[PDB]
Amino acid sequence: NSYEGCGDLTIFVAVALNKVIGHKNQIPWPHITHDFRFLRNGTTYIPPEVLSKNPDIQNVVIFGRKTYESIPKASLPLKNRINVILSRTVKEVPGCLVYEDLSTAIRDLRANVPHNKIFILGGSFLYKEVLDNGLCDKIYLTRLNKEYPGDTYFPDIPDTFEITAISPTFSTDFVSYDFVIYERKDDPPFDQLLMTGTDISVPKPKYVACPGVRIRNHEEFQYLDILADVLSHGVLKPNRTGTDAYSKFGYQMRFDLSRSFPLLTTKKVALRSIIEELLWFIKGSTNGNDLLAKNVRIWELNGRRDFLDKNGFTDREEHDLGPIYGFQWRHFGAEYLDMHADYTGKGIDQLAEIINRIKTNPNDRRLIVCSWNVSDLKKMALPPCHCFFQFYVSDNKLSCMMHQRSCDLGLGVPFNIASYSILTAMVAQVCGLGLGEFVHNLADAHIYVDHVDAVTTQIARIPHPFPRLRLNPDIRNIEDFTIDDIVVEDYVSHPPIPMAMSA
Amino acid sequence: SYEGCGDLTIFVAVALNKVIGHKNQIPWPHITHDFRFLRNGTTYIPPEVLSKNPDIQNVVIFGRKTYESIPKASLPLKNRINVILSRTVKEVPGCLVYEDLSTAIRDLRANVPHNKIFILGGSFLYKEVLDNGLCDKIYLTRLNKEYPGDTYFPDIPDTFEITAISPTFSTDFVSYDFVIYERKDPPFDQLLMTGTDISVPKPKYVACPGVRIRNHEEFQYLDILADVLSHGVLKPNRTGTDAYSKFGYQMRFDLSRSFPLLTTKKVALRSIIEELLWFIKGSTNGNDLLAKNVRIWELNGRRDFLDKNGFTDREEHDLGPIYGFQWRHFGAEYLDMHADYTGKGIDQLAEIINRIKTNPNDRRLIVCSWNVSDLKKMALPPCHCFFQFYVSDNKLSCMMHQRSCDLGLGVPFNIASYSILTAMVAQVCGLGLGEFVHNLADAHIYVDHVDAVTTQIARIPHPFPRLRLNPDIRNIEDFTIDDIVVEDYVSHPPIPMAMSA
Ligand SMILES: NC(=O)c1ccc[n+]([C@@H]2O[C@H](COP(=O)([O-])OP(=O)(O)OC[C@H]3O[C@@H](n4cnc5c(N)ncnc54)[C@H](OP(=O)(O)O)[C@@H]3O)[C@@H](O)[C@H]2O)c1
Ligand SMILES: NC(=O)c1ccc[n+]([C@@H]2O[C@H](COP(=O)([O-])OP(=O)(O)OC[C@H]3O[C@@H](n4cnc5c(N)ncnc54)[C@H](OP(=O)(O)O)[C@@H]3O)[C@@H](O)[C@H]2O)c1
Ligand SMILES: Cc1nc(=O)c2cc(CN(C)c3ccc(C(=O)N[C@@H](CCC(=O)O)C(=O)O)s3)ccc2[nH]1
Ligand SMILES: Cc1nc(=O)c2cc(CN(C)c3ccc(C(=O)N[C@@H](CCC(=O)O)C(=O)O)s3)ccc2[nH]1
Ligand SMILES: Cc1nc(=O)c2cc(CN(C)c3ccc(C(=O)N[C@@H](CCC(=O)O)C(=O)O)s3)ccc2[nH]1
Ligand SMILES: Cc1nc(=O)c2cc(CN(C)c3ccc(C(=O)N[C@@H](CCC(=O)O)C(=O)O)s3)ccc2[nH]1
Ligand SMILES: O=c1ccn([C@H]2C[C@H](O)[C@@H](COP(=O)(O)O)O2)c(=O)[nH]1
Ligand SMILES: O=c1ccn([C@H]2C[C@H](O)[C@@H](COP(=O)(O)O)O2)c(=O)[nH]1
Ligand SMILES: [Cl-]
Ligand SMILES: [Cl-]
């Protein structure tokens, strides 16, 4: 074979959403220093055992002539690595080995040039040859969630590869991105099992999210693992709605809001409705028509005549939802009359108070907005699912924890995660703080029985990098945010998954 | 003399007074779980070894008296080579017999194919194995109670350390766990795919660093202490003693198995129980606790604190509309600690206990103490703000949100307190016990507690105790301190920790 002995080459590459890798012999996007540190660390690692036996050993990096010309001259040859250039027009390049083709080079290297591992650093001529001929067994790929103008493209990865590793999602001010590993498709010590004190042979879980992904550092795996856990181990229970659900109690997810915006990528999520709902909460509204007028229908069934009449609200106007979330956030303790009454100056404006306290006393440990107003529960169309939330400041960063008493994992939860993430970013901005973490506590977490097929489909889908959130920096008071001031960039998702509401 | 006789592995079960036998029998009632542990531990063959020789077995060695203490119908122990040491019996059916240990170990390793050798007592054998350094690993079941006995496990030499601890388990009669003693003498992609520095300085503080298998629930708490000391931000707070702080944790405790009263220091249980009873009765009068020799709320009811925080017209120890008031009278107009609130406000505790009985699948089983309208009247707003029950498989669980968590002082009380409350509610509702899930928001260690918590996180946990409530108690208001009993509590010494106000 022409390529006898030239296999197990490892690719590093960074690829835009449209598959572009190069533009006018340069990188098509603004410099991502993080990504270069990742290439460098990836391509210069020698296992400790190998380095102790041959302390001067290095890895090899191979690239095409044009890619060599695309690297700043002061950085060449790439440090701590044997640089190999392929060319049929140039014979000699300072500090590098030069070969006329790949097969010659790999063979020469492995027989005559002691080294550790060989890496392929492009361009497309090389990537294409390496992929077209089965020579690569692993690909380290940086995924960028944006299209870029370009003239040089990464070839399609064959379906013989699968993603086995995904990093957390990162972002610059111009793109969101992550790091993945692709590999070709083709146990714990006994004391671990013994010292659980339980059965040493446990039936493994019936459902596992993305079972081919071994390194699972994308934050969305927290959610997918929860879906799989409830399906695997949840108890089927009746509930208020009349559609039964699989249920399990107590989870805690966290999302680093400085790095990405946690809008699920495993289905297309309706962001516009999330933003409109949040703005409605912030303005204190209990009038469901304010959402219908904006083509947001998420609260419609809970304001309808037949639901109201079914739950004792026979004197309530349609879509008068009672003293729910927004009324509690802005008017806790005020006497609810109807959705048309004037509550200016009535009750306690918790949102205003807490935002002011974050500014004036950030180390306070009572930065809480509470919607569980025990005195008003009976008056609400539905008691709040997201009950309570608390802020925290350290090192000039704002975090938020939220208690969700009841968590419809298929429908509500994805909205709830995005909602509090926006709110936290809004509060951080108006308080001049950076972003910490959103911590989401799930109490009764459940999957309605009519969503099982949808969730089964969803947990097999490989997450894309999360998008990023940009708020208009001119907005200085939380009441002034409008939907045009809240922008999610670089959202790449799998298709929407229809999921029917029980009620 | 013992050349080639090392690396013997001991299994044993030991009571708190070191007793292992009584009248040539086991001193405690039978723990079937413990025997499964023994059987599983001593019959295991690695899969690589088992496929190369499919008939291979481990060896179990015991003294003659231990062999005579095993029911005849179980002998020889199945799937193992049974070896008895004796100078008076020469033949035992189904077994090998030797006159001493060195002879037997040498004969076995030279002439009797086998996998691993286990030492199953008695004290004549354990004493020989330990005195002569022949053991490298000990699987030991720790029982938290003393038993009458006449046969004792020898002291384990300080050349051994505990390297594994199971969760705590319990029967009706004892709490126990499994531990491993041994002699004191990450693939790159995992580092790369974090996307952060590949060279990561180890945390400055690590709880019980010799323990590698860390299945005791108390490690959740100790790990948090170490995490806050290692990675918490030092910042000011209301008290004027700074604290190291980190945000957002979640612990869980299986209340069916044990009672999570910390064992790494002696915790003042009596005060936890009296405080809980005071909450349940809806009291806001701090004198009701002082009269019972419980002073945990005393500084917060003092004139000096009241007057500095603007409560100049409040009687001393009138704490205002705090926890108990909100539990039993949410929405009532607070006057003072001497007023009658009978039939005023919403009795959340009563309402939720009834709903657990009538509609356990309800998803609003919440008691909330964060009464925004009353916060300004409280001597201190509640630390444990909100709690929520859950029922599945005839078991009650509870989750509680703690806004502010003094890891040194308050948190150990808070864990035990909600554990008792959940057990109490389960009993009056006819349910079993699920889990207590404890959510920590601002979790912190005051600077003057750093020395104390450094001492504490190096202590090896004992098995947790167990809770027994008087079974005759039908209504939550009828529990008295005599009805709430913690059994088998073994702990390290108390650690003094001063309150920052
Ligand atoms: N984002 C990323 O990860 C990444 C990675 C690499 C490169 N890039 C970008 O990609 C662009 C450069 O890649 P490119 O594909 O244009 O060029 P390239 O593959 O780097 O260079 C092509 C040259 O290499 C020689 N060569 C090697 N193998 C060959 C083959 N099989 N057939 C023909 N010639 C071969 C030839 O030089 P002679 O003409 O001397 O024979 C050919 O002209 C730049 O814009 C660079 O910034 C991006
Ligand atoms: N909790 C636990 O894990 C555990 C484990 C084991 C046993 N036990 C309890 O321990 C008690 C029995 O232990 P024990 O200490 O009384 O007796 P033991 O050690 O089992 O047996 C003593 C007898 O075995 C022979 N023997 C032991 N070591 C020998 C050696 N090195 N060389 C020659 N012969 C040796 C001698 O028999 P001859 O007199 O025939 O020479 C000696 O009299 C029982 O109550 C049993 O239930 C408890
Ligand atoms: C994950 C990945 N990201 C990339 O941007 C990338 C680029 C190349 C193209 N090529 C092989 C390059 C190597 C180095 C370059 C560069 O412009 N470097 C900067 C920073 C130096 C460093 O830290 O590596 C410079 O020299 O100024 S461009 C090949 C594989 C890749 N792989
Ligand atoms: C059983 C139940 N589960 C819920 O999640 C729930 C949610 C709300 C209000 N809530 C806050 C909602 C969030 C998201 C929703 C929803 O229907 N999402 C659909 C379509 C979104 C759209 O097109 O606007 C989806 O995600 O597929 S509804 C009201 C009653 C409920 N009842
Ligand atoms: C951890 C441990 N616990 C023990 O109780 C124990 C006992 C011995 C003493 N000896 C080595 C024994 C082996 C088996 C026995 C026994 O009494 N078996 C009962 C119980 C059967 C079951 O529940 O599985 C029997 O055979 O009926 S007693 C040795 C090591 C130990 N190790
Ligand atoms: C800064 C601060 N931290 C607290 O944990 C705290 C707790 C209370 C009330 N609380 C709920 C208490 C729980 C436990 C306590 C305590 O002092 N424990 C000591 C002594 C116990 C005793 O012997 O009675 C200890 O555990 O060492 S105090 C009041 C103010 C506070 N202030
Ligand atoms: O923002 C929301 C609002 C509601 N729910 C879900 C949880 C339940 O499935 C249902 C409310 O029903 P109850 O728990 O109140 O029965 O809606 C959410 O997940 N998020
Ligand atoms: O049951 C309690 C009561 C209080 N605290 C702690 C947390 C804080 O350190 C302090 C209360 O002070 P603030 O958070 O309110 O400032 O007491 C507890 O840990 N548990
Ligand atoms: Cl922001
Ligand atoms: Cl007043």
Residue numbers in the entry:
A (entry chain A): 3 to 188, 195 to 511
B (entry chain B): 4 to 188, 196 to 511
Q: What does the report in the manuscript say about this coordinate set?
A:
Pemetrexed and raltitrexed are folate analogs designed as antitumour agents and currently approved for use in some countries for treatment of cancer. The two complex structures of BbDHFR-TS have two ligands bound to each subunit of each protomer in the asymmetric unit. The pteroyl-like groups of pemetrexed and raltitrexed are parallel to the uracil ring of dUMP when bound, mimicking the pteridine ring of the native cofactor mTHF. Although the ϕ angle of the C-terminal Ala511 in one protomer of the raltitrexed complex is rotated by approximately 30° relative to the other, this has no effect on the virtually identical binding modes of raltitrexed in both TS subunits in a single crystal structure. Both drug molecules are also observed in the DHFR subunit but appear to bind this substrate pocket with different geometries. The bound conformation of pemetrexed is virtually identical in both DHFR protomers but differs slightly from that of raltitrexed, which itself has two different binding modes for its glutamate tail. However, the para-substitution pattern of benzamide in pemetrexed allows the formation of a salt bridge between the α-COOH of its glutamate tail and the Arg83 side chain. This is in contrast to the 2,5-­disubstituted thiophene ring of raltitrexed with no salt bridge to Arg83. The five-membered ring of raltitrexed causes a >90° rotation and a 6.8 Å translation of its α-COOH group relative to pemetrexed. Moreover, the glutamate tail of raltitrexed is shifted between protomers of DHFR in the same crystal, with both making hydrogen bonds to Arg42 but only one contacting the N∊ atom of His33. The loss of salt bridge and distinct binding modes of raltitrexed thus provide a structural basis for its lower DHFR affinity relative to pemetrexed, independent of the reduced chemical affinity associated with its C2-methylpteroyl scaffold.
In this work, we describe the structural features of dihydrofolate reductase-thymidylate synthase from B. bovis (BbDHFR-TS), the causative agent of babesiosis in cattle. BbDHFR-TS is a homodimer that exhibits the classical dimeric interface seen in other structures of ThyA thymidylate synthase and bifunctional DHFR-TS enzymes. This 511-residue, 58.2 kDa bifunctional enzyme consists of a di­hydrofolate reductase (DHFR) subunit at the N-terminus and a thymidylate synthase (TS) subunit at the C-terminus connected by a linker. BbDHFR-TS is an obligate dimer, with two arginine side chains (Arg373′ and Arg374′) from a flexible loop in one protomer making contact with the terminal phosphate of the substrate dUMP in the opposite protomer.
